[PDB]
Design an enzyme around this catalytic site. Sequence first.
Site: not given
Length: 468
Positions: A252-256
């Site tokens: 997801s978003k948070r992982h880059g």
Amino acid sequence: MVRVRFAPSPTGFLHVGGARTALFNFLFARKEKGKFILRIEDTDLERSEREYEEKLMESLRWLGLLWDEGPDVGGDHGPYRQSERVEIYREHAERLVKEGKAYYVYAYPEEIEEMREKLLSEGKAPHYSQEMFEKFDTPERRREYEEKGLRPAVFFKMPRKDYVLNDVVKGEVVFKTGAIGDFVIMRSNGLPTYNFACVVDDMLMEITHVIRGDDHLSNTLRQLALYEAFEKAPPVFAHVSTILGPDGKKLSKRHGATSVEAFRDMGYLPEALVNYLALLGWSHPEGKELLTLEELISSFSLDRLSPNPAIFDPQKLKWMNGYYLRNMPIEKLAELAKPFFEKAGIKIIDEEYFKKVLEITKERVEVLSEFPEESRFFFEDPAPVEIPEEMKEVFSQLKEELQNVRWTMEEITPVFKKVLKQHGVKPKEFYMTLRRVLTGREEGPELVNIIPLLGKEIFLRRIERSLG
Ligand SMILES: [Cl-]
Ligand SMILES: [Cl-]
Ligand SMILES: [Cl-]
């Protein structure tokens, strides 16, 4: 004999999971010398939103995952957009209704969701039946649907029986009787659901193998029942790994960066991404990870698809990108790198000089966007550094000494040794200060490589400018 498909719902961005799924179909189609179909799931998209399909197709061609049949390339099993097949699904839905396998429902989508929650609050299973919708089948409601341009939704009678999926990756997946209830196959707006459109297209397009993410495994129960309803043998199913981020949670978003477009903008190569995408849910028999596209096609197989999840490693992708970036032909590496320099303000007119500058600095960059800041000193003169007191006289003598000399280290180095020994100056501090004069940084490529590439004029101009 062999026919596979990639069936994305274009959102504008092709994410890693999609790119990976398209790759496995591409590799299988190429290996078995079958056809690879592109089907655009554009049911809910408008005519104006066809640019999402244009971007997804662009990204697939950037990765090199070319298809045999699709909305642009055509094919005998078309059309390849679900928006253009609305009448085909309607024809099939009405056929099930006539056979007593499906039925019409006049309840709104705002309702149903009400009884869904009523069943859940009452402790009952949220499974629908034909008698539950008879309340809404009134002449007043049929008029309201006619007057508001709506049609009754078609629901499929889910039979009370066990369904066994013999998956290639997951193996035997038993869907026990009474798992789910009746479900919507055609909505009240005349458009089909994913599962119904998926089965109708898989049959009509003669799909032999369905290779897709394991998140569609629950949906396979609903599809297997529909295949049986149409009395057609289903295709072979292969449910590939869930891509997790490095901490274990879903990607997801948070992982880059998650999109193929984001990696292209940051400066990743297609061969790097494709090779890495191949490893997300499959492994080479001997554990080999640096594989060319030809090697992937030859070594890939459905028996080596992992039933377990794939963990996304950004370090490994970036490292693997650096590998391809350094071993890539300099002619190609130049055209791919050039826009990143122009975007960074560095203008490139000399093509031969540019290839030489990249050939040195490529060992220090993993991604193409790193080139401009790494190679900046090779084009623009750096900030002038204060040359220490004891060396002022040494650096000033180099203008005279190196004037009548072939611009090569074999002739330049002995001149440095002569002047340093003559003045009684230690070489460590001279080469440190010289780096700051030419590069304006504490580290960079070997000074033996930097000096000859820059001109005689560029070398001497930077000395006098640094202190005089
Ligand atoms: Cl699918
Ligand atoms: Cl509906
Ligand atoms: Cl140094």
